[PDB]
Enzyme design. Sequence first.
Site, PDB file in Angstrom:
ATOM      1  N   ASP A 189       0.839  -1.198   0.000  1.00 22.12           N
ATOM      2  CA  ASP A 189       0.000   0.000   0.000  1.00 22.12           C
ATOM      3  C   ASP A 189       0.876   1.251   0.000  1.00 22.12           C
ATOM      4  OD1 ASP A 189      -1.938   1.956   0.361  1.00 22.12           O
ATOM      5  OD2 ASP A 189      -2.175   1.535   2.503  1.00 22.12           O
ATOM      6  N   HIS A 345       8.240   3.654   5.689  1.00 23.84           N
ATOM      7  CA  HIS A 345       8.430   3.435   4.267  1.00 23.84           C
ATOM      8  C   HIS A 345       9.554   4.358   3.831  1.00 23.84           C
ATOM      9  CE1 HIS A 345       5.576   0.820   2.271  1.00 23.84           C
ATOM     10  NE2 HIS A 345       4.615   1.234   3.082  1.00 23.84           N
ATOM     11  N   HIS A 379       7.639  -2.448   3.400  1.00 20.07           N
ATOM     12  CA  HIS A 379       7.476  -3.891   3.607  1.00 20.07           C
ATOM     13  C   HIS A 379       8.471  -4.472   2.602  1.00 20.07           C
ATOM     14  CE1 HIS A 379       3.857  -3.441   5.982  1.00 20.07           C
ATOM     15  NE2 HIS A 379       3.319  -2.687   5.042  1.00 20.07           N
ATOM     16  N   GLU A 404       4.445  -8.984  -0.846  1.00 17.37           N
ATOM     17  CA  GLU A 404       3.108  -8.604  -0.440  1.00 17.37           C
ATOM     18  C   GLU A 404       2.209  -8.833  -1.629  1.00 17.37           C
ATOM     19  OE1 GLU A 404       2.145  -4.809   1.458  1.00 17.37           O
ATOM     20  OE2 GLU A 404       0.084  -5.536   1.473  1.00 17.37           O
ATOM     21  N   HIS A 406      -1.331  -8.658  -1.405  1.00 13.75           N
ATOM     22  CA  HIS A 406      -2.615  -8.273  -0.847  1.00 13.75           C
ATOM     23  C   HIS A 406      -3.797  -8.352  -1.818  1.00 13.75           C
ATOM     24  CE1 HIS A 406      -4.384  -5.486   2.509  1.00 13.75           C
ATOM     25  NE2 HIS A 406      -5.163  -6.519   2.237  1.00 13.75           N
ATOM     26  N   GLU A 449       0.993  -9.019   4.275  1.00 14.30           N
ATOM     27  CA  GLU A 449      -0.297  -9.290   3.657  1.00 14.30           C
ATOM     28  C   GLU A 449      -0.262 -10.173   2.406  1.00 14.30           C
ATOM     29  OE1 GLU A 449      -1.487  -4.988   3.493  1.00 14.30           O
ATOM     30  OE2 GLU A 449      -2.683  -5.480   5.260  1.00 14.30           O
ATOM     31  N   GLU A 525       1.701  -3.697  13.399  1.00 17.39           N
ATOM     32  CA  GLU A 525       1.038  -2.442  13.023  1.00 17.39           C
ATOM     33  C   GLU A 525      -0.094  -2.116  13.992  1.00 17.39           C
ATOM     34  OE1 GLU A 525      -0.191  -2.209   8.896  1.00 17.39           O
ATOM     35  OE2 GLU A 525       1.518  -3.426   8.248  1.00 17.39           O
ATOM     36  N   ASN A 585      -7.466   4.810  -7.829  1.00 15.33           N
ATOM     37  CA  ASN A 585      -6.527   5.251  -6.807  1.00 15.33           C
ATOM     38  C   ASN A 585      -7.265   5.300  -5.472  1.00 15.33           C
ATOM     39  OD1 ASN A 585      -7.457   8.146  -6.004  1.00 15.33           O
ATOM     40  ND2 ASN A 585      -7.608   8.066  -8.253  1.00 15.33           N
ATOM     41  N   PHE A 589      -5.519   7.844   1.479  1.00 18.55           N
ATOM     42  CA  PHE A 589      -5.124   6.724   2.314  1.00 18.55           C
ATOM     43  C   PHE A 589      -3.617   6.484   2.365  1.00 18.55           C
ATOM     44  CE2 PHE A 589      -5.350   2.233   3.835  1.00 18.55           C
ATOM     45  CZ  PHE A 589      -5.999   2.536   5.023  1.00 18.55           C
ATOM     46  N   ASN A 592      -0.622   8.375   6.362  1.00 16.42           N
ATOM     47  CA  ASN A 592      -0.970   7.851   7.683  1.00 16.42           C
ATOM     48  C   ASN A 592       0.166   8.104   8.674  1.00 16.42           C
ATOM     49  OD1 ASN A 592      -1.445   4.974   5.652  1.00 16.42           O
ATOM     50  ND2 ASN A 592      -3.045   6.518   6.018  1.00 16.42           N
TER      51      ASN A 592
HETATM   52  O1  LIG Z   1      -2.692  -3.323   7.230  1.00 13.72           O
HETATM   53  C1  LIG Z   1      -2.136  -2.387   6.746  1.00 13.72           C
HETATM   54  O2  LIG Z   1      -2.554  -1.109   7.076  1.00 13.72           O
HETATM   55  C2  LIG Z   1      -1.942   0.135   6.537  1.00 13.72           C
HETATM   56  C3  LIG Z   1      -3.078   1.072   6.135  1.00 13.72           C
HETATM   57  O3  LIG Z   1      -2.582   2.394   5.928  1.00 13.72           O
HETATM   58  C4  LIG Z   1      -1.023  -0.149   5.317  1.00 13.72           C
HETATM   59  O4  LIG Z   1      -1.821  -0.455   4.163  1.00 13.72           O
HETATM   60  C5  LIG Z   1      -0.119  -1.344   5.644  1.00 13.72           C
HETATM   61  O5  LIG Z   1       0.832  -1.509   4.597  1.00 13.72           O
HETATM   62  C6  LIG Z   1      -0.965  -2.616   5.770  1.00 13.72           C
HETATM   63  O6  LIG Z   1      -0.147  -3.680   6.257  1.00 13.72           O
HETATM   64 MG   LIG Z   2      -1.509  -4.102   1.745  1.00 10.33          MG
HETATM   65 NA    NA Z   3      -2.343   3.483   3.951  1.00  8.46          NA
END
Ligand SMILES: O=C1O[C@H](CO)[C@H](O)[C@H](O)[C@H]1O
Ligand SMILES: [Mg+2]
Ligand code: NA
Lengths: 1011, 204
Positions: A189, A345, A379, A404, A406, A449, A525, A585, A589, A592
Site C-alpha cells: 500500500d 516506508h 514492507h 506482499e 494483498h 499481507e 502495526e 486510486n 489513504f 498515515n
Molecule cells: O494493514 C495495513 O494497514 C496500513 C493502512 O494504511 C497499510 O496499508 C499497511 O501496509 C498494511 O499492512
Molecule cells: Mg496491503
Molecule cells: Na495506507
Amino acid sequence: RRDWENPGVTQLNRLAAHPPFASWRNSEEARTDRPSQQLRSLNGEWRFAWFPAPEAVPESWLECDLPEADTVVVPSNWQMHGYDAPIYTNVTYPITVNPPFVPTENPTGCYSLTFNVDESWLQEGQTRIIFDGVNSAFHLWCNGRWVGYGQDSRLPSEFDLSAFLRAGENRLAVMVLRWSDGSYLEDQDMWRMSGIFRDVSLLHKPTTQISDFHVATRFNDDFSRAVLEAEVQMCGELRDYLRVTVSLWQGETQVASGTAPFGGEIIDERGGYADRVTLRLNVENPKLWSAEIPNLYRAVVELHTADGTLIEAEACDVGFREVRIENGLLLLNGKPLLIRGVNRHEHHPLHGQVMDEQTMVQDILLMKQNNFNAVRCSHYPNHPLWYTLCDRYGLYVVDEANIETHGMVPMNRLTDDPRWLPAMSERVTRMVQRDRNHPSVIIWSLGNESGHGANHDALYRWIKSVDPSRPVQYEGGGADTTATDIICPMYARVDEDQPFPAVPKWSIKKWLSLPGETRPLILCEYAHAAGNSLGGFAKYWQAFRQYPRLQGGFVWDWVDQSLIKYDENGNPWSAYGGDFGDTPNDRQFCMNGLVFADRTPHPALTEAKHQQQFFQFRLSGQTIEVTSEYLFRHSDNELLHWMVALDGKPLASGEVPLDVAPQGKQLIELPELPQPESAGQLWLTVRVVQPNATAWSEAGHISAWQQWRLAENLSVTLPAASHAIPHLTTSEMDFCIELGNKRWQFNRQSGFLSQMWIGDKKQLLTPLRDQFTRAPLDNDIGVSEATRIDPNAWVERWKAAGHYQAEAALLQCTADTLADAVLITTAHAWQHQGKTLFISRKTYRIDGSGQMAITVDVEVASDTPHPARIGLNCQLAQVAERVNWLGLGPQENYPDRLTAACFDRWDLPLSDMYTPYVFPSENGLRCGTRELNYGPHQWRGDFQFNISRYSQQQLMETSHRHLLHAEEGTWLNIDGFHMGIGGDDSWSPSVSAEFQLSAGRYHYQLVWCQK
Amino acid sequence: AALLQCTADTLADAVLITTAHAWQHQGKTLFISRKTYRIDGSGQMAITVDVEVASDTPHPARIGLNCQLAQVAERVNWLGLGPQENYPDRLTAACFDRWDLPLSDMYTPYVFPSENGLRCGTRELNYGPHQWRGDFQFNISRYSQQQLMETSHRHLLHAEEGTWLNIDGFHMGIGGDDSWSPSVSAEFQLSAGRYHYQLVWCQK
Ligand SMILES: O=C1O[C@H](CO)[C@H](O)[C@H](O)[C@H]1O
Ligand SMILES: [Mg+2]
Ligand code: NA
Ligand SMILES: [Mg+2]
Ligand code: NA
Ligand code: NA
Ligand code: NA
Ligand code: NA
C-alpha cells in the site's frame, strides 16, 4: 522470451547475494570504514528515454545513444521527472490480475551511461556492477552485449562485467520494465513507481577473494564473556599459503585477532568445506549493543598470504547482543524488550522512493527524540545505509522481505502455490544473506499481507535453519500461524475483540491466554495515525506495561506519503492519490504518518513520545517516585525539573539529579511548598531533562514529563456588587441588552444572540448558535478504499441521521429583568424530517459587571447516532494575532488523545491553533480549558475549543489544505463536550465507548466578557 | 454549610431563589453548592443544583439532597430501575419501568445497618401528594442516615416521625471485590469535580 512474465525466471546471470563489500586493499581503511578505491559510484547524470512498451525500443539504442533521450540524475524514479504518472492504490493491483502476465503497454525506461574504466581494473581481478534497486525488472547490456536480467525491486542485483568491459570508454544500457511477474509480489500500500531508484556502483575484487562471511556472537550466562565467531568463504584458486585473519576492534584498541589457513571442519561423509574457514575470538566483558547504548566493535576480515601480503579486506560493525525468546518473552541480552516502534516506508515528497543519508538521519533523530527504539522495514529490504545508521545510532530493526500479494483472492493464492515458491524464496534468502551481519536487525519478517501459504512455512524454517540468532515473524493468515515466533497482529484492539471469520483479531490481552498460546505478542502495526488520529494510544501503553508478554508494537506509520505538485503560481502543494490522473486510486489513504512528508510533526507525535517515555512517575504526599524502564543504562544524563503553579502562575520550582539504575526506582521528596496566595488549583509538573548533548539529541532535551493536581482551594469569595444594572429593550424582533458602551442583540425569530457591540464596533459576523457536528476526520470517514462507501462509518451515520442538515426550530425565547441583570431564556429543537434530533435549552444572564453567563442543557435522542460534539460556534468579526488560554496544551489535543498535553497558561500565534492536515478536517482542539482569551474577549468555564480562519463547513467541503482560504474574521468553536477521534484503525468505527457522547443529557456553562 | 448567597427575584410568572453554600472543615472548603429554585404559576418548583468538590478531598459518597417529610404513605411509585435495591455498580439486574411497592420494601433489612434501598435511573418518584421529576437516584424510609450509622443492629432501629427522603443526582459505587480494602472501581467514584442535576417538585 518475455522473462518478465515468468515467475520461473527471476534473474539471468546474477551473482550470489552477500554482505556489503568494499574490497579494501588497505586494512587500516577497512578498520575505519573509510572510502574504498575499489568501490566506485556510478551515480550522477545518465541518459534516459521513455517508451510505452519494450517492443518500441529501437535496436540502435543498444550500441548508440538515442538523440531523443534526455540527461537525467540517477538514482531516481522516472515518475518524479514527469515521464509518466505515479500511481497510488492500496489493495487493488495497478495491473489486471492475470498472473504471471502484465499489460502489453508496459512503461519502459531506457537508461544508458558512458563511463571510463582503467586498464588496471581489467588486467587483473573481477569487475562487477551493482544495482541496489531497480523497479521492477530490467535487462542489462554492456558495450552492446547482453549481460543479464534481474527482478525484486528492493535488493541489489550484481553482474560480472569483467568480460564485457574495455580500457577507456564503455557504455551501459539498462532497459527497466515498470511491470513484471515480480509486480505480483509487490502490492504494498504505497505509490507505484519505477526506475533505477537506488545506487549503482562498480566493485573490483581480486580473483582470489572473500566471497562471503558471517559474524556471530554467543555469550555465557551473565554476558560477562563472549565468543565472536566469523565464518569466511573464498572463491578463486585455493593455495596452502592463503590465510584469513579476523581482528576485532573497540575504537582504536585492537581487542582480539585470529589467523588460520582455509579448510573447515568435517561436515559429512564427503569431508568439509576446503574453501571456508571459521575464526573464533574470545572477548571478556564485552560492551553490549542495544538501542539504549549502541556499543559497536569493528571486525576486519583480511585475506592474505603467509608471507604477509594482503590480497583484500572486508569488514563490518559488530554489536554484541543476543536475541532470543524464552518462556514466552522476547529477550535482548537476557532482558525483556518493550518495543516502542514504528513502521517506516522509504518516502520523500520530492524524490519519491529514492533515499538519501540526510533524510535517513533526520528520521532517526526525530524517532529517538520521540522515544522510539525500533523500526519495521515496511514492507521490503531498505537502502543499505539504513542498517548502518540503525547500527550506530541504536534502533531495533525488523528486516522484512519484499513480498506482499494483498490484491489476490484469496490472499494466499500465490504463496500457497509451489510454482511461486522459487520467486518467494529469493526475496527471503537474498535478504538474509545481505543483512545477517547487522546488529540492528533483531527480527526477520517473511513479508506482508500475503495470507498464509505453505511457501511461508518453508521459508520460515529456512531462516530458522540458516540463522538461529534471530526470531522470525509473519502476520499473514491470522497473525499466529506456524510461520511466526511472535503473535504480530495489525490493529488488534486492547480490550475489544473483532471475531472476523478465519482470521479474527482478538483483543491483545485475550490473545495471549488462548488455550495453548505461549508466544510473546508485538503488533507489527497499530494506532493508525491517519490525519487527526492516535486516539486511545495511551490504552495500548497501559496494557503493554501491565502484561509482560505484550511487548509493544509498531505504529502505522512514520511519514505521510504525500507528493509535491505545483500550482499556476509555481507554489508547492501536497498531493495524494488521484492528483496525478492516476486511476483507480485510493486518495488520501497514503497519508498515515506521525509526521508530514517534509518531516514536520503532526500533533500525534507528542502523544506518542509521552506514552513511550522511559521514566514512570508516582506521587504520594510530597514524594515523587521515579521508576526507570531502561534495561541496560543508568540515568547518567538525566535531571528532573519540578514546578508547582497555581492556575498557570509559578509558585515554586527546583531540580534534582536523577540516579536510577535500569529497572530501578528513586525517591525524591519535594521541599515544603509555600501556601498558595489565593484560590485555585495547584499543579505539579515534572520533566526529565538531558543536560548533555548526545549523538541523537541536543543539550536540554526533554525526554519525559508528567502532571498531578496538588492542593486546591475552592473560591468562596463572591465578587462585589456591580455599579450599573443592564437595561432591556423589548422590541418585536429583538431583545436588546444595554450596559454602558456594550450591547447584546438577541433575535426573537431565531432565538440566537445575533450581534454584540462594544461601542460602535460589531463583534460578530455570524450568530452564536449550537453545533453538533464536525468536519469529518479520516477516522470518521473510515475508508481504506476510495471505491467503498461504508454505511457504518460515523460520517455516514451522521449524514443519514440528518445531523449535518438539521434545522434549529425556536421553541421559546423570553426575557426577564432581575435585581441586577437581564435573563434571556431560550429553547431550540433540531429536527430532520419530523425527527427531533437535539433540544437545546439555555439562559443568558447579563449582569451589571458586563458578564454574560451562558448556561446550556442539551438533550440528545437516544436513538440517533451519538453527536461529534455538543457546543456553540460563531464567527467573530475580529482577527487577532495571539490566542491565550488556561487549559491543556500547547499542542492540539482531543478527549482520547490528551495525556501528553499539560494544564498551564499557554500563548501562541493564531496560526499555531490550526493543524495543517493535508486532507482538511476538524482540528486544533484543546481540551480542559478554564479560560480563553482572544482579542478583547474572554471565555471562562470548563470547555474544549478550536479557533481559526476556517469554518467547519469549508474544512468539510475542501479536499486539500492548499485550497483553503482564510474566511473573514475568526471562527470559534467552544464545546462543552467533544467525541473522541479514535484511530485503532481507519476503516471501521474506532472511537471507544467511554469517548462517545452517549449520556443523552448534557450540561455546560460559559462566561463571555471583556478581557 | 456556610451561607454565601441567598437572593430572591420576582419574574413574569415565577419567583426565583438563588443560593450558594460552602461546606468547610478546619478552614478547608470541601464542597460548594449553588442552586436556584424556580416556583412558577403552576405550583411546580424547579430546583437546579451545581456542586463543586475540592479535588484533594476524598471523593464523596453522594451528591444530592435530603429532608424528612412529615407525611407517611403506604406506597412508593416510581418510574426507574427496579423493583429491587440497585446501585450504580450493581444495577444490571434492575429494569426500567413503572414500579409500585409498599414503603417497607424500600428498606433493605441488612443486619448491620447502613445506606440501603437506593434505586437508580429514576425519572419520576411519587409518594403521597408529592412528585419529583428529573434523572436521579433515591432511597426513602422511616430511618435517617444518621440513625442508620449510629445503630449497630437492625432490630434496634426505630421508625422516626415522618419519612426520610434521599434524592441524589449522583451516588458512589458500593464496591465489594473484597470488604477489607477500597474496592469501588474508579469509574464509579465521584471524581468529576463539578456535578450538575435538576429536579422538579410538585403536588399531585
Ligand atoms: O494493514 C495495513 O494497514 C496500513 C493502512 O494504511 C497499510 O496499508 C499497511 O501496509 C498494511 O499492512
Ligand atoms: Mg496491503
Ligand atoms: Na495506507
Ligand atoms: Mg520473470
Ligand atoms: Na509488557
Ligand atoms: Na542523572
Ligand atoms: Na475535508
Ligand atoms: Na451501623
